[PDB]
């Protein structure tokens with residue numbers, strides 16, 4: 012969007028595209044570090060990387076579970092976190108594209124918005140699946156409940172990264188003009204601002220009202236109990252009956268089948284002659300030692 | 312005498328195997344064959360002679376002849392008669408050769424005899440427990456006459472279910488979708504395991520007999536002859552008159568009992584009136600999964616006026632009590648009979664308009680075709696009998712082959728379709744509503760008259776026969792042996808859907824999750840009739 016703006020000589024398009032792109036770059040690096048380090052902590056305490064055989068981690072390590080909840084809600088672009096602001100500026104740049112005078116830009120304007128809505132909804136689904144089959148429900152391996160809490164500095168690093176993610180989320184209106192010092196010109200959303208602090212205040216204070224109402228409308232309410240198993244229509248519950256990532260991602264395989272079959276088609280792996288060699292994997296790492304040793308020394 | 316030709320064919324195919332043969336009635340025949348030569352005889356009469364394996368069951372005759380008795384009832388339908396194949400299983404080593412590797416319809420009767428009597432069919436592949444619950448102690452065989460008292464209750468071994476479900480086409484990655492035993496709109500306990508990959512059903516196993524009361528043992532211990540007619544009515548609320556007529560005709564065929572003329576065909580009137588009640592309930596449930604609900608409540612309305620003639624011909628709702636061994640209890644009078652005639656006609660008025668729903672044909676063309684297809688090849692092997700086998704192409708009907716309550720004086724029409732879909736089985740039941748309404752139109756205007764009851768007769772001991780009725784879901788075959796003037800030695804009942812159940816694996820295969828309750832209800836199961 013920024014390159015199209017500098018092609019069309021539209022400074023608002025350049026400003027919106029560049030800061031949206033670079034803000035989303037910084038925010039993505041933050042919450043991706045959150046996600047990778049937390050998944051590594053889960054592997055560190057358990058030993059498994061397959062989410063089919065990784066359930067019930069939210070009760071074993073709750074600090075890590077909260078940190079991955081923040082990271083998943085930050086990556087799937089949800090307000091007021093840091094993955095939503097950059098997508099908002101990118102959508103503003105898309106709307107500036109949709110009003111510029113060009114047939115190649117007006118045709119491409121709303122289509123990018125439609126497909127970015129596709130991508131956001133698919134990301135929301137993917138992180139719903141990831142949090143559901145990993146940090147929620149009963150564990151599906153004996154190796155899972157044996158996992159104790161995360162270490163000290165691992166938890167410190169992941170919580171500090173999540174704190175930075177939340178800070179970059181709510182303080183977007185104070186950090187976006189800081190990035191306006193690099194791409195240097197006025198930011199011109201189309202007559203609209205979004206304000207992450209009021210969404211932040213309106214997402215902690217609004218759920219207090221049903222809490223107050225249930226605190227008022229309760230009479231002889233017994234304390235809430237979490238004792239039994241899930242209701243599976245009279246028969247007892249088994250490990251083969253829970254729905255996991257295999258069964259949760261079936262209608263996307265149902266509706267988006269042509270793209271997933273296009274994955275198999277455009278795969279020119281058999282056309283390379285020396286790809287199936289015995290020692291091709293070791294040969295590549297053998298010349299890798301040669302190449303790094305000869306290119307470092309010529310710089311020094 | 313009916314059945315001479317089949318006996319001659321069995322004698323020429325097997326020279327010295329028929330140890331004894333006798334006739335129960337003119338159309339009823341039994342043969343005693345050798346134990347080690349049993350599977351060849353029943354397979355011959357099944358495949359070569361075109362016989363259908365109706366019911367097979369054990370017996371406890373250790374104080375009559377010192378041997379167990381396993382019967383094999385076959386229905387000759389190529390004139391048409393009943394052939395029962397009887398074997399004498401040894402007492403201290405109960406083992407007889409199995410039929411399931413040869414006839415697939417012998418898969419649950421030979422699983423029931425493993426549980427009720429403890430007899431061991433050698434070579435049976437499906438050895439899992441069928442009727443007894445999972446907490447039942449092993450060697451207590453209930454239907455053995457000396458294993459336990461009817462009133463004894465063993466301690467449950469386990470609280471959790473220990474049943475094993477097989478996955479023929481799936482693997483260890485497939486998920487399961489329960490549909491029982493406590494499911495809404497099922498209204499009756501029965502577990503199902505849809506081994507699904509997405510919404511598609513790869514395989515389907517099920518656990519049944521959650522409603523196994525154990526009334527086979529109670530009918531021979533605490534209960535007499537006229538009182539089992541109350542037991543047959545309280546099996547299920549919709550086949551009540553089917554079980555009672557099937558049991559009554561088993562005891563009247565066991566003796567002579569020349570029943571009076573109108574007491575036969577009034578049972579034929581009430582047998583068809585009940586299938587107005589049961590088919591229009593299934594057609595209402597057919598619209599509650601196809602989609603429309605204003606097609607269901609309206610089938611509930613035409614079901615109510617079917618319940619209105621059942622209110623006036625008897626005076627009861629659901630479980631009744633109108634048949635005795637000699638004849639019928641309560642008797643119909645003139646205006647009731649003139650009246651039922653045009654309320655039969657106005658239903659044919661109403662039924663025609665409501666059937667204009669499939670003429671509408673939107674969810675009745677995409678949801679109900681290609682869904683739950685029952686192979687006529689498979690239906691012939693497993694001997695299904697209801698609208699399942701009539702949709703699949705076989706004109707199997709008891710009222711045409713074996714007229715039992717004077718159906719020969721009534722206009723009989725057998726309707727068989729060619730497609731095997733859900734919509735094909737609805738078309739069987741739609742044409743059966745008009746057919747039953749023709750009998751009510753032609754039955755109640757030409758009653759022969761005479762008496763109603765024949766009582767005072769003495770029950771000859773150790774006399775048995777087969778009783779049969781055309782239930783709305785197929786036939787129920789009742790085999791009862793008289794014990795004395797008061798009690799029964801043995802009463803065996805097979806439900807209409809008992810033969811129908813072992814083919815649900817081959818319907819639910821290849822279909823979806825969403826229409827799976829429609830496939831189950833397409834054949835209109837009566838769990839309480841089959842669970843006994």
Ligand code: FCO
Pocket residue numbers: 547549550553554782783784785786787806807808809836837840841
């Ligand atoms: N129809 C019916 Fe009831 C069952 N199954 C009987 O017979």
Ligand code: NI
Pocket residue numbers: 547549550836837838839840841
């Ligand atoms: Ni029934």
